[PDB]
Design a protein around this nucleic acid. Structure first.
Lengths: 116, 50, 177, 78, 66, 136
RNA sequence: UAGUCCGGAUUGGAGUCUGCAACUCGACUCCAUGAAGUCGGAAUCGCUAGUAAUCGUGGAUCAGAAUGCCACGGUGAAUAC
RNA sequence: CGACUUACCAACCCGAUGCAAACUGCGAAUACCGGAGAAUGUUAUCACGGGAGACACACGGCGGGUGCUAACGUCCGUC
RNA sequence: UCCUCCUAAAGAGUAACGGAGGAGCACGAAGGUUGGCUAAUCCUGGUCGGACAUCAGGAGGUUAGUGCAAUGGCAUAAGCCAGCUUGACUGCGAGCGUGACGGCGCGAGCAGGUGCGAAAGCAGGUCAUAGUGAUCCGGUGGUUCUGAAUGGAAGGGCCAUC
RNA sequence: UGCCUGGCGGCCGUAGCGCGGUGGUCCCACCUGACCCCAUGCCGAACUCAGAAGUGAAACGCCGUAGCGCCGAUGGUAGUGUGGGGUCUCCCCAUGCGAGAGUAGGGAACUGCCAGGCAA
RNA sequence: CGGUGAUUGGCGCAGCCUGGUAGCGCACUUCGUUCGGGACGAAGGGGUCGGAGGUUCGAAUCCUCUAUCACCGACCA
């Protein structure tokens, strides 16, 4: 299976990360409309959520689901995370290898000022 | 019984040494471990000796 | 890949009327072709496997992977983690070229050929044939080899029944004894 | 005749030392156990012998979580 | 695919005795001369000389001559 | 002699025979031989009470044996002092609770089964009774 | 210089002769097939002159059926202290 | 080289039936730890200091190992 | 002498010449970090190849594995594979557990110096429980700590260790 | 505010299996090409990149179906704390607790935060 | 009554210790020599380690239980 093999893949980075009570940054790589959101350490509510499925992001991008679209998400998350007074977060791969669009979404957050 | 003991002597100016065991009759090569030296306060590469 | 574009609008279109499918993705497609070579006698000579690995470098298009022993039995004197065979799992672009070279100019090179068995299916639609010579492929120069033992071609498709995968190979005329 | 048994060992004194709501000062061993019969939860650490030691001078509380129902040991903070 | 470990994949031009010139991608080398292809092979005519092989009454009447 | 085959352990504890029985209802046959007294039946006692019972119901018919011993009993030899290990296994007993059906029988009339369970009850150290398969 | 263009058994098909008739149970021919066999252990045989060794022919027996038997010639040694 | 009849033994699931100290998809009563509260009990609770004795136990109930579910037998836990 | 189960009576502990088994090792990778993966046993097909080698597919679910006999535990895997490394480091250590004691065991956190990972983070050994013996005496190296008038040295003391 | 869908949780089989049906303008999956970023102890199958022609086939979500799994009464039974008794290797009485298995039955999950589509 | 050590071709012995092979002297089968036996040379055949049941990928080998085959014991009242 493709979906359930990734859930057990990320569970090591979920159960250990919520044990420390860290405000986590959960990314969800998809070949179209890559997602990213900021989740409170209680696990039941979120604080900042932004991606290319909204009409305020995809109108300035040619294709949603490549590297320069993932750079537009990670910049848009860090501009909204500083408005809530959230500086120190922890990145969550969510079962994706830190090579491509999940790295450019993490590089663009570290350029804007999201300290992790 | 088979696994005899050796002495990892520091290559630095001091004479501090760690002790350990090594099976000679199966893997006869010397150890080149890199542990902390408490006298020099450095991380000097250790060498095998008796 | 001559018969890759022939698959797109002369084989899929043919199979939509034989088993009355309703969607274009319901057609059985072929996934991979795996070339095992069960050398077996590598406990005596290690270079016998290296000569067996050199035969898949000419019959297939890439380097084989040696296969370690899954279990260990004493009836053949093998241990856990010993290379006892070698496989080539070719798929994608080079498999339509290998399937072109196999059924056209390598199956008629079989000595004492009457036809392939039509009952060699595993109840899912995956065909497996077995040949007994290397000289059915033109890439072997006939002087560097010293063993009669050939290989076995396994064609893995995405069918569900034996009749459903039988009509997929039947478009390539697949002589069907 | 003769016998071949008569051999055992120093009983290891395992089990739970501190139960339910019973204030434990940080670093206090709670459960001494063979494997992870009881798993470590909130504020409670797990040692190299699967001794769940407390980590915050508070209470205790056992639970069952996930989809395996493993008694779990947390620490209410008082 | 990887580099430096795989053999050559140069396209060649095969040919049989029936004149069926067909280019393939293989690792033979310079050229290739073949015997038969999927066509012009005795597989659909090979079974023609197999059905009417048996029979002993028609063998007998050739020695009866009338 | 009903004897088990490759038990997990050779010798087990003595154990008490407290509690009630489980095999109360007559399931396989139509007439049962239910026990009333609390005792135990050695492996020779099942086979001896089977010979005196099967012959009275002459071999046509069918007899179910609802008990199996699977419990070893040790016995020290003569002129052997106490201790120095556990004794050697000699025979196999079946722990019989009150209410356990011992034998069942079908294919015979009610008169033939009545005068045959009495012949098997005199081979057993426990007091038994005559029961019949009831509906539900 | 290879079990190889050596060797020919075995076997399948098609035939010829003889004889009343060729399956048990004949001889020969055509095609195909290709085995053991690479000089043979202990031990043992024949021969000293046209001799041994090698090659072919003929006769009896006989409708047909010999590598056997009986005869005829071609080439032709070595050694006997 | 191939196989025809098949009084018989019989693996895994299926339905039913029992057993186990070294089996538990279940599961008590007691017992033990911690917290709150009334009453009672010559602080009956803990720590330190001075002095010991004792370390051969026996029986009865209950849960047992063993012995023969034998012993005013032996070995355990509580009263 | 030590370790595992039961007896052992649902906290711990608990005896017998009671019932079953093991240990006096090993590993520089079989340790640490990061990344990825899920078997056993059957069924069918397929060259030698057969009950069992290797290849493809299905059921099944951890009945497999965990270096080692047993118990508990393991899918976030502690099981398997690959890359990099030596935290198998030094000085401590709040706080408890278990012992009559000698002792043993877990351990958050501080300083220095590193390893892996982008980072959060983990690592002062191995899934845990056996793989071991107190003292005296003597040996090896370092540290002027002492050193019998003074200056050395011998011998003692401390640390690491046989 | 409703219907959907996607991500993150509580709860962990009343929540999981099987059968039948259904979903593509959103979303999701399959797929497309891979010279390049990366990588296969061979294969781009996995991982990774650049795109959107086709499909809802496989996967996933939703609904129905009890054919299994699962939950679970009330009563009864076993067991047992305390005090007595007996034909005392076992059982009963007074009182307190009260199973397991089984039966009637329930049962095709509920819900919190945010984003997108649609109808309002 | 236990305790110690073996039971491998038709005979009895090495092989076990230290797991991946079943071997030796005889005997038997055939040929050779002799008129013929016996003797002697040459070729060849025959067990799969008492049985069961562990351990490992694998057992004659390692452990446990058995059967009868030998030796050692069996006290002092």
């Amino acid at each position: 299976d493709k979906k359930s093999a990734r859930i057990r893949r990320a569970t090591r980075a979920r159960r250990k990360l919520q044990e420390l009570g860290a405000t986590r940054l959960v990314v969800h790589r998809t070949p179209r409309h890559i997602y990213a959101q900021v989740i409170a350490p209680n696990g039941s509510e979120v604080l900042v959520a932004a991606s290319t499925v909204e009409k305020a992001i995809a109108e300035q991008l040619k294709y949603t689901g490549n590297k320069d679209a993932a750079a537009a998400v990670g910049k848009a998350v860090a501009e909204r995370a500083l408005e809530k007074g959230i500086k120190d977060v922890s990145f969550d791969r969510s079962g994706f290898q830190y090579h491509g669009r999940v790295q450019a979404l993490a590089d663009a957050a570290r350029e804007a000022g999201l300290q992790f | 019984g088979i696994r005899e003991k050796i002495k990892l002597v520091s290559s630095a100016g001091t004479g501090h040494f760690y002790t350990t065991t090594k099976n000679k009759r199966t893997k006869p090569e010397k150890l080149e471990l890199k542990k902390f030296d408490p006298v020099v306060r450095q991380h000097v590469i250790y060498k095998e000796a008796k | 890949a001559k018969l890759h574009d022939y698959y797109k609008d002369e084989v899929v279109k043919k199979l939509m009327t034989e088993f009355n499918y309703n969607s274009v993705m319901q057609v059985p497609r072929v996934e991979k072709i795996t070339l095992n070579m069960g050398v077996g006698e590598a406990i005596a000579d290690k270079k016998l496997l290296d000569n067996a690995a050199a035969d898949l470098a000419a019959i297939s298009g890439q380097k084989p992977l040696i296969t370690k022993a899954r279990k260990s039995v004493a009836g053949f004197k093998i241990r856990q983690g010993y290379p006892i065979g070698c496989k080539v799992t070719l798929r994608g672009e080079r498999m339509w070229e290998f399937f072109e070279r196999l059924i056209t100019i390598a199956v008629p090179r079989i000595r004492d050929f009457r036809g392939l068995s039509a009952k060699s299916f595993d109840g899912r639609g995956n065909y497996s044939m077995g040949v007994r010579e290397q000289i059915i492929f033109p890439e072997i120069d006939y002087d560097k080899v010293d063993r009669v033992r050939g290989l076995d071609i396994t064609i893995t498709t995405t069918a569900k029944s034996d009749e459903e995968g039988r009509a997929l190979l039947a478009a390539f005329d697949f002589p069907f004894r | 005749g003769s016998t071949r048994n008569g051999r055992d060992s120093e009983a290891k004194r395992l089990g739970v030392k501190r139960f339910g709501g019973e204030s434990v000062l940080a670093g206090s061993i709670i459960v001494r156990q063979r494997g992870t019969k009881f798993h470590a939860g909130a504020n409670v650490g797990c040692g190299r012998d699967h001794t769940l030691f407390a980590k915050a001078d508070g209470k205790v509380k056992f639970e069952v979580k996930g989809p395996k129902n493993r008694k779990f040991i947390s620490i209410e903070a008082e | 695919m990887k580099k430096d470990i795989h053999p050559k994949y140069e396209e060649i031009t095969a040919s049989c005795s029936c004149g069926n010139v067909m280019k393939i991608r293989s690792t033979v080398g310079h050229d290739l001369n073949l015997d038969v292809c999927s066509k012009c092979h005795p597989f659909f005519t090979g079974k023609q000389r197999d059905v009417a092989t048996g029979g002993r009454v028609d063998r007998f009447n050739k020695r009866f001559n009338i | 002699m009903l004897q088990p085959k490759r038990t997990k352990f050779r010798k087990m504890h003595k154990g008490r025979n407290r509690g009630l029985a489980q095999g109360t209802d007559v399931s396989f046959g139509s007439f049962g031989l239910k026990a009333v007294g609390r005792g135990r039946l050695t492996a020779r006692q099942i086979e001896a009470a089977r010979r005196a019972m099967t012959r009275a119901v002459k071999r046509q018919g069918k007899i179910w044996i609802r008990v199996f011993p699977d419990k070893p009993i040790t016995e020290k030899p003569l002129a052997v002092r106490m201790g120095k290990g556990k004794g050697n296994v000699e025979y196999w007993v079946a722990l019989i609770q009150p209410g356990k059906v011992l034998y069942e029988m079908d294919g015979v009339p009610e008169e033939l089964a009545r005068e045959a369970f009495k012949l098997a009850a005199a081979k057993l150290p426990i007091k038994t009774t005559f029961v019949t398969k009831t509906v539900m």
